[PDB]
Amino acid sequence: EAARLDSELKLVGEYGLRNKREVWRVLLTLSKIRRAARILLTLDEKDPKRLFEGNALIRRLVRIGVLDESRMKLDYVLALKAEDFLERRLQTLVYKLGLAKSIHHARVLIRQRHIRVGKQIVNVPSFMVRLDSQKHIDFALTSPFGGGRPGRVRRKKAK
Amino acid sequence: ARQAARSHDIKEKRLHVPLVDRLPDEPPPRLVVIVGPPGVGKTTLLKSLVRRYTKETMSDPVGPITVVTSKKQRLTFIECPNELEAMIDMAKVADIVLLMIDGNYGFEMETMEFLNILANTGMPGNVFGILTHLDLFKKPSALKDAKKRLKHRLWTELYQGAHLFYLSGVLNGRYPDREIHNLSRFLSVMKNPRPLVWRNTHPY
Amino acid sequence: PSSMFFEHNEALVPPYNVLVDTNFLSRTVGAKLPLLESAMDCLYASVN
Amino acid sequence: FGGSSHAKGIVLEKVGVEAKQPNSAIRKCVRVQLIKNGKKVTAFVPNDGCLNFVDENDEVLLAGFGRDIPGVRFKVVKVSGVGLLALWKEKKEKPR
Amino acid sequence: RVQKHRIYIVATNDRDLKRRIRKIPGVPIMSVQKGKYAIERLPGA
Amino acid sequence: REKLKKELAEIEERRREKQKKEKKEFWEREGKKRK
Amino acid sequence: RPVDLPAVGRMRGAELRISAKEAAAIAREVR
RNA sequence: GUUUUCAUUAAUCAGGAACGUAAACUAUU
RNA sequence: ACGAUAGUUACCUGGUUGAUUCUGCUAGUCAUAUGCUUGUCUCAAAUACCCAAUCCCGACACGGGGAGGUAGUGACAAUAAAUACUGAUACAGGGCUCUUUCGGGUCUUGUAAUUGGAAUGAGUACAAUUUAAAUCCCUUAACGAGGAACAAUUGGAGGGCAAGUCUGGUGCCAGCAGCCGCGGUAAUUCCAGCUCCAAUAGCGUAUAUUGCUCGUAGUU
Ligand SMILES: Nc1nc2c(ncn2[C@@H]2O[C@H](COP(=O)(O)OP(=O)(O)OP(=O)(O)O)[C@@H](O)[C@H]2O)c(=O)[nH]1
Ligand SMILES: [Mg+2]
């Protein structure tokens, strides 16, 4: 349908994704989380199952940084979306932190091993960066934007 | 129901055109060609196969070599020389084909030429890819990469899922005995040749 | 209208506004089916 | 046919080999004889230049034709173990 | 209402109104299909 | 405009084909009812 | 069709006949 | 109708039993 | 108390038929066969190497073990994701859209243009390490990108073409189509790489599909 095609094209364009399999992957994990939230809303308030399982779900989503720290209700967990998940991806986080000029530049950098998340370099652009780990995204020490060797085209030109 | 569907699909797979056999009760020796580019070791495989079968160390084996391999059937090995006239002469003759590929160097035009000459003239039953010069390798990751790419190109060439043997070394000037023993396990037990129309009408 | 990207309505995000017709309402009472609970179980989101 | 999805056949005679216009369906249709049952049915080669690979007395796999002669039900899929579109695209040579 | 504002999900079951609201871009159609509901043209679900 | 009119004529041909198919299916069902 | 008619068994007048499978089908759904 | 008696005797039909020239316009309401 | 002293204080109108306007004109299979394609990483449905670990048997620390562990294949699935990123200048004036179409809507878009930067993993690979000995992994010096390549595929829809060919007929039209044209194959540089849609290391096809009454066993 044209609505599905235009929606998936807006996702693939707005966040520099490769195909629609990544969109369907995110929509599947989002539907799993939202199904768990609906099943926890089935029960009444102050049931211990709903209390502890909903607190676990909300603390998990706030810790992985999707759900905002302001709103912490299970209705907002139902109101979650795939734009929030693709915003929590690593590639858009490199683009928004400004190490790269565009989202396709960010995917290129993460593929050819320039950025690192915390200590180790990250080869995958779909790395779900958590909220505590959002700040420690920077260029690695072996990268010419970080330091070390001046690099490849630089070496061929400076010879 | 699905068992009936798979049974019907296999019952349609078993079918062919009803051609005439024309094989005698005391059949002649089946003809094994050893085809390949120059320098690949066809004569070396000939020496090694005849030592496996009849235990005779031939210092210079030429011509067709007939060999008893079973109580019912027997073989004959002919090594095709590196000339196209002999290759086109024997492609209409061959009963089973031992098609040699030169390992690290990859495929050659003589190998592809004989494959499509054989396919255009008449396809026999059994063609076995034999991949040699594997010992001229230094990295055993490049070795399995070359085996995989040569297997897939040969499968595109003749048919999917063929037999591709890997003959590694040259110990006593001959070949390794275990490798040629499983090669002869494959070319010893045999099935009747394919009913080709040219061989079933004309006497050669 | 704003929030329309080529037949993709970006205005509909949960809580979903759902208009109900009489045919849908008569058949969802006829099929022994609770209205808001089945709409929430269909959309996995809070409907009004 | 039968209970299977594809049937095998022998190409008896390419009917309509002397038709005038190039992509006529009478030019494309081929009378084959199914092996399992024995009946002679007609099948479409998918293309007029692709007709040249279908020779007489060749084992031919054929499937249904699901969409100028409306009612010819089968189409030739493989000829002598090689896919007919691959022969047409010049990927494979035909083993004869 | 839907032509003016277009924020709604129309829940119907008659094919006349369904074909009438399929012409306009970007409204989902919810219809009961004998076990549960079924949403037609919503991309996020 | 001429490209749009060509595609509109193709759509109307498909509409006439489906109309004939539905008409024959309906009258094939009714002709058994009046028999 | 009437909306008010329940979905388990057939209704004749004021008498509602439930076949033995249908009361078993509800007991299967509970378990 | 009675200013009449036994108080479930009853309801339904597998099996079975008695009676035997035509067609052609059509808990209440 | 003023108000129908025979509630007839009722019934006396049950709504034919037509015109116009607005609506309406399939998708999954842990399901089999088959076709095309396949560079990287983990992973696994299906005649290889050794007792090195754990274990066992003996005159016995050494000798001997078909349990066990190591490796190889694999698009049946499943997992991650390469095939490029970013500027400047020059030139053109159109690009796009639709309900309503010889009509309306919107304002920056291109180009087989000219140049410049960097980034580099596939692969090649000295080693060291891993290990029974090897491999993989982790470390790792050195090379390793300009398209005519380090060469993305599978399907579907559509346009344009001859001193060519075929068919129909009250001239020049129409249809099917067209690798086939005068020459020319070391000749040609042409739509120079036609346009659009879908999935994209996956994708398609086929089929299956989803006469009446009494009366007993019995029943209430
Ligand atoms: N390392 C290595 N050497 C090989 C292998 N096979 C053959 N050779 C050598 O390559 C040489 C080629 O000899 P042949 O095999 O007689 O060549 P041929 O093509 O069979 O004979 P001609 O057709 O007459 O050249 C021999 O000297 C072999 O020792 C192999 O698998 N590995
Ligand atoms: Mg020789």
- Rounded CA-CA distance E8/E27 in Å is 7
Q: Please name the residue whose Cα sits nearest to atom 15 of ligand 1.
A: B41
Residues near A47 by Cβ (< 8 Å), separated by ≥ 6? none
Which phi and psi angles does D51 have, rounded to 5°? -60, -30
Among B33, B34, B35, B40, the mutation site with the greatest number of ligand 1 atoms within 8 A of its Cβ is B40
In whole angstroms, how far apart are CA C8 and each of A4, A29, C14?
A: 7, 22, 15
Query: What's the DSSP call for residue B63?
Result: S
Q: Which of B154, B159, B96 minimizes the C-alpha distance to B126?
A: B96
Experimental approach was cryo-EM
Query: D4–B8: do the CB atoms touch at under 8 Å?
Result: yes
Which phi and psi angles does G12 have, rounded to 5°? -130, 105
Q: Distance, angstroms, CA B178 to C1' I59?
A: 40
Q: Write out the two tokens for B177.
A: 């005995």
Does residue G1 sit at the C interface (CB-CB below 8 Å)? Answer: yes
Type of residue found at D83:
G
Q: Please name the residue whose Cα sits nearest to atom 14 of ligand 1.
A: B41
b/e code C13-22 from CB counts within 10 Å (16+ = b): ebebebbebe
Query: Which chain B residues 138-197 have CB under 7 A to strand I?
Result: 138-142, 144-145, 147-149, 151-152, 156, 160, 165-166, 178, 181-182, 185
CB-count exposure of residue B176 (10 Å: 0-12, 13-18, 19+) = middle
The radius of gyration computed from the CA coordinates of chain C, to the nearest angstrom, equals: 13
- CA neighbours closer than 13 Å in the CB half-sphere of residue B87: 21
Type of residue found at A57:
L
Q: Please name the residue whose Cα sits nearest to atom 30 of ligand 1.
A: B133
Q: Write out the two tokens for C32.
A: 């022994």
**Angle CA(C44)–CA(C45)–CA(C46) in degrees, nearest 5?**
140
Find out whether G9 and G16 touch, Cβ atoms under 8 Å.
yes
Coil, strand or helix at C11: coil
DSSP letters for B69-138:
-SSS-EEEEEE--S-HHHHHHHTTT-SEEEEEE-TTS---HHHHHHHHHHHHH---SEEEEEE--TTS-S
The radius of gyration computed from the CA coordinates of chain D, to the nearest angstrom, equals: 12
Query: What's the DSSP call for residue D46?
Result: S
Closest ligand to residue B79's CA = 2
CB atoms within 10 A of CB D85: 13
Resolution of this entry, Å: 7.0
Residues in chain C with CB shorter than 8 Å from the CB of G7 are 31-32
Among B34, B44, B168, the mutation site with the greatest number of ligand 1 atoms within 8 A of its Cβ is B44
Coil, strand or helix at G30: helix
Find out whether B110 and B42 touch, Cβ atoms under 8 Å.
no
CB atoms within 10 A of CB B129: 23
Ligand 1 contact, B43 CB (< 6 A): yes
B82-91 long-range Cβ contacts below 8 angstroms, 24+ apart: B82/B37, B82/B38, B82/B110, B84/B113, B87/B35, B87/B113, B87/B114, B87/B117, B88/B117, B88/B121, B90/B33, B90/B35, B91/B33, B91/B117, B91/B118, B91/B121, B91/B122
Which residue's structure tokens are 């990544």? A22
Q: Write out the two tokens for C6.
A: 């080529």
**Total CB pairs under 8 A between chain A and E:** 16
Smallest Cα distance from C15 to chain E, Å: 11
The CA-to-CA distance between both ends of chain E, in Å, stands at 23
- Rounded CA-CA distance A56/B125 in Å is 66
- Rounded CA-CA distance A24/A124 in Å is 18
- Rounded CA-CA distance A101/D21 in Å is 59
Smallest Cα distance from C3 to chain A, Å: 12
Ligand 1 contact, B132 CB (< 6 A): yes
Closest ligand to residue B100's CA = 1
Query: Which chain A residues 65-94 have CB under 7 A to strand I?
Result: none
Find out whether D51 and D11 touch, Cβ atoms under 8 Å.
no
The secondary structure element, H or E, covering residue D82 is strand D82-83
- Rounded CA-CA distance A40/A123 in Å is 36
CB-count exposure of residue D27 (10 Å: 0-12, 13-18, 19+) = buried
Mutation to test the C interface, candidates E9, E21, E31, most C Cβ within 10 Å: E9
Atom of ligand 1 minimally distant from the CA of B167: 31
Ligand 1 contact, B170 CB (< 6 A): yes
Which residue's structure tokens are 């008896």? D12
The secondary structure element, H or E, covering residue F22 is helix F2-33
The secondary structure element, H or E, covering residue B151 is helix B140-157
Residues near B101 by Cβ (< 8 Å), separated by ≥ 6? B36, B40, B107, B108, B111, B129, B130, B131, B132, B150, B154
Classify the phi-psi angles of A102: left when phi > 0, otherwise alpha if psi is within -120 to 50, otherwise beta.
Answer: beta
What is the SS3 string spanning chain A?
Answer: CHHHHHHHHHHHHHCCCCCCHHHHHHHHHHHHHHHHHHHHHHCCCCCHHHHHHHHHHHHHHHHCCCCCCCCCCHHHHHCCCHHHHHHHCHHHHHHHHCCCCCHHHHHHHHHCCCEEECCEECCCCCCCCCCCCCCCEEECCCCCCCCCCCCHHHHHHHC
- Protein residue at shortest CA distance from C1' of I201: A19
Q: Write out the two tokens for B192.
A: 């009747």
